[PDB]
Design a protein around this ligand. Sequence first.
Ligand SMILES: Cc1cc(N2CC[C@@](C#N)(C3CC3)C2=O)cc(NC(=O)Cc2ccccc2)n1
Ligand SMILES: Cc1cc(N2CC[C@@](C#N)(C3CC3)C2=O)cc(NC(=O)Cc2ccccc2)n1
Ligand code: PRO
Ligand code: PRO
Ligand SMILES: [Cl-]
Ligand SMILES: [Cl-]
Ligand SMILES: [Cl-]
Ligand SMILES: [Cl-]
Lengths: 486, 486
Amino acid sequence: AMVTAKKDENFSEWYTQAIVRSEMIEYYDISGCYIMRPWAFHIWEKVQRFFDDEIKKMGVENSYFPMFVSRHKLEKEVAWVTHYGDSPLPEKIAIRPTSETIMYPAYAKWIRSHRDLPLKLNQWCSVVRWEFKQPTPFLRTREFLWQEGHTAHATEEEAWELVLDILELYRRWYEECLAVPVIKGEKSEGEKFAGGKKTTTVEAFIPENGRGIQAATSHLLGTNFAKMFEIEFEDEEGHKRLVHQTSWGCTTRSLGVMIMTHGDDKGLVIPPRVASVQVVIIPILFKDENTGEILGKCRELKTMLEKADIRVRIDDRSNYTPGWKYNHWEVKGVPLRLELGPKDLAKGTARVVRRDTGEAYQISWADLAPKLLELMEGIQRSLFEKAKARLHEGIEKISTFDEVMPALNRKHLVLAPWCEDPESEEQIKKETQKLSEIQAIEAGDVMTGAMKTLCIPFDQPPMPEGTKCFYTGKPAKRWTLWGRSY
Amino acid sequence: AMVTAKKDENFSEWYTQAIVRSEMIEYYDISGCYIMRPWAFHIWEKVQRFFDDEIKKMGVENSYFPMFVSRHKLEKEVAWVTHYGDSPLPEKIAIRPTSETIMYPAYAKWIRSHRDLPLKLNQWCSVVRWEFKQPTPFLRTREFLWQEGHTAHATEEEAWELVLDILELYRRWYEECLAVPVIKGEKSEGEKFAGGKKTTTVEAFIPENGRGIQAATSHLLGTNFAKMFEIEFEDEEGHKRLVHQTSWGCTTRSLGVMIMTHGDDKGLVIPPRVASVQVVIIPILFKDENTGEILGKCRELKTMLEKADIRVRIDDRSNYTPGWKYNHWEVKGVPLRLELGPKDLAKGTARVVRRDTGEAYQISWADLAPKLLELMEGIQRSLFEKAKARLHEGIEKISTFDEVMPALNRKHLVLAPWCEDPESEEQIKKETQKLSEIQAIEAGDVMTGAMKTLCIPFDQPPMPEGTKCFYTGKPAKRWTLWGRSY
Ligand SMILES: Cc1cc(N2CC[C@@](C#N)(C3CC3)C2=O)cc(NC(=O)Cc2ccccc2)n1
Ligand SMILES: Cc1cc(N2CC[C@@](C#N)(C3CC3)C2=O)cc(NC(=O)Cc2ccccc2)n1
Ligand code: PRO
Ligand code: PRO
Ligand SMILES: [Cl-]
Ligand SMILES: [Cl-]
Ligand SMILES: [Cl-]
Ligand SMILES: [Cl-]
């Protein structure tokens, strides 16, 4: 299978082909659920190991809470269990959409003293959000894998520092592992987590459809949940005070974002840092050659590379041509391929082809390990810098509302001065929705056309005094990133 | 909190105290579900890492399949989802009790050629079995964490070899990691997995209540599921043949078995190979001492031990006495404690106390790392050998049915010659159930009294010719292990 849809022409068909023909996903009879095959699951394991190691250094501990929540606990897009076999439960129980109402009664019991704080827990599990909108493999599904962390602190300042530290870990998850550039920012009051005080986010951008997408999230819950669940601690005075809480999560959406960011017309391109196969060795196996010698040297090279921690597989299958194998591992996104035939063996070199650019190198066997390490770092860096340039070109800085629709029609995000009044965001969503529908009827034309806030970026351009809001004309408070979204 | 119930007197109360006061579990409002706190979850992560590494060496790959299964797919103790919010789904969908019916349609699609075999997949997830019997934390719960592996092979012999290789991994999981002795064997026709051809098992034994328990399971499914799901492959001839399948699983039940096996009146005893804290360092901190010097040496020793891969924590909390800390870490089962005070510092030694026997050692700082490594191996081995001696003393070899009830009253298993006729197992279950109820009414007295087969052990004692079945008098075929069970 080759990918035949072009990424810049039919992006939806291209994406489906890339994830199916690489054997990353399989479809399923229940809408919005997808099977995650090993080729994709290996990447999830890699980013999971990364994030787990990092939060353990912060003193976060893993745990496991039940997948079921009582009606009363939850009620204090949800799939309800109502019967065991054909017997009706007295109270129906819900499948977790998130675990605040499952965990926080326990927290209230566990926390008594300032000596019990901070309390830092995480769990890896799946959650269920049963919407009816258009599902997208990896990006927006009814069941998905995630991690959710939940912490409790004696002070707001300590909780806020943790929120930001986790957000930095999510920046590293995307930018350092997956080579996807993200924008750190704060959500608007309309878009933040309802029961929380402040929601921070990293946002990603999909150029081919112009859409922003929330990559991960980190919430300062403050004391609201502590009030509702009576999570209190005693200082050394003996005075009871509410804890200050955080929660934060990130999902297999990250994989989809990586796929969309780096893929090309040939299929997947997997950044070397998360590729389960970094180097595929393809021996050339003529009938009229010493095949034993060539396969032996491939095994020697595999051992030599694995001593440098390079993840290698040899595709020595005799029933497929080298051309078939080149395409097979290109579709799967292996970042380097190493070709070895009798002429290479005679010269003591190997031919290495990088997946992102197709550039080829002749490398002597003694230089192979350090040169491939350097090449993989270069591939990783180049994937990131090109995605970052696409991000910067995808954002238009505007000053008035009449620049919105043209910028959206170019599939761009807009960075605009905003008064942050929450009524104005609703007005903007509804107006851009209506104008988008008009434009659709003029084009002769599934996913919403409305523009919403994506985030208020931590990195703020200058704000000249007396800059007006781009929609209300009221005095503008901060630069805000807007766009169509998932 | 100290444990105050005695293990040999009130075993159920002892178990609850040990797992609650060590902070391993927390209760939950839904019967049969329990929260797994970090102290327990760390042990699960350890055995998970072990088993994952081992099966990856066998070429098994992890994956993730949805938690939901359609009514038709399943129907081809189950919790049914029937509504999203308060809207009724056209077909109700079930939460997975096991994933054969979720995975095998996909297998049928993926397998076309002998070149596609073997196919070896595993997943780590939770499943739901919604029974109403008495739940037991770790051992028998409505939701539990497990791994389930599913493989497909071109021949029965290859599938059978895999079944046995996995069963050996489960023996290692219990005996090598958890120091719990298990018995490998084959399940009776009445107790085997229904749709499979042959079920193998490792069985454990709980002496304090006399009960056997299935520790893990590995099934030769053969071609039955291949028939039902039309999983076929083509040889190089072009003839379509059914695949031969296996499936195998093991759960957090293993943790409960470990707890019950090694615990004592003081609480948990965690084998060093899975203990998240292997050595706890407790500084003695008099008011009238150079506390800075003692804490500094504790940190030096921690660094030195961690260079030998020993997992160390220092409990330098000033507001608790050393006696309090000794009990606190004993209850949690830390296998070694290291005490350091001014006199030790003056002598250049440390006092080390092993959790299992309470024996103390004075060890010079230079010998500390290799001596503690040797001590931990000795602790691990001694935990295992004492549990193995308890297992051997808990099994009575009998020849006639009238020895059954006395052996059961001694809380023993029986090894008996058996005709393996399936009707006889039902008769034996019902008769021993009835006799147990009579005995209960004579004692002035929740869990079933019936005796069933636990397994037909791979290791068979000699079978003198003409040995009769202990219940039917028919010619006996093999020695069978029987007992009361979970
Ligand atoms: C795969 C994935 C991811 C996420 N979300 C949420 C926000 C978040 C972030 N950031 C989580 C907090 C961490 C994220 O990734 C959400 C989802 N499904 C849904 O909303 C349900 C759905 C299904 C079909 C169509 C529309 C909606 N599906
Ligand atoms: C914790 C745990 C474990 C296991 N089982 C099963 C066999 C197996 C083995 N071997 C699995 C194949 C791997 C195992 O461990 C099973 C369970 N709950 C249940 O049966 C449901 C239940 C709940 C309350 C009372 C009675 C029954 N709960
Ligand atoms: O869903 C959310 O956004 C928060 C963060 C993870 C748990 N709850
Ligand atoms: O439940 C069982 O016993 C088998 C083995 C794991 C998956 N199904
Ligand atoms: Cl291969
Ligand atoms: Cl900030
Ligand atoms: Cl501590
Ligand atoms: Cl055998």
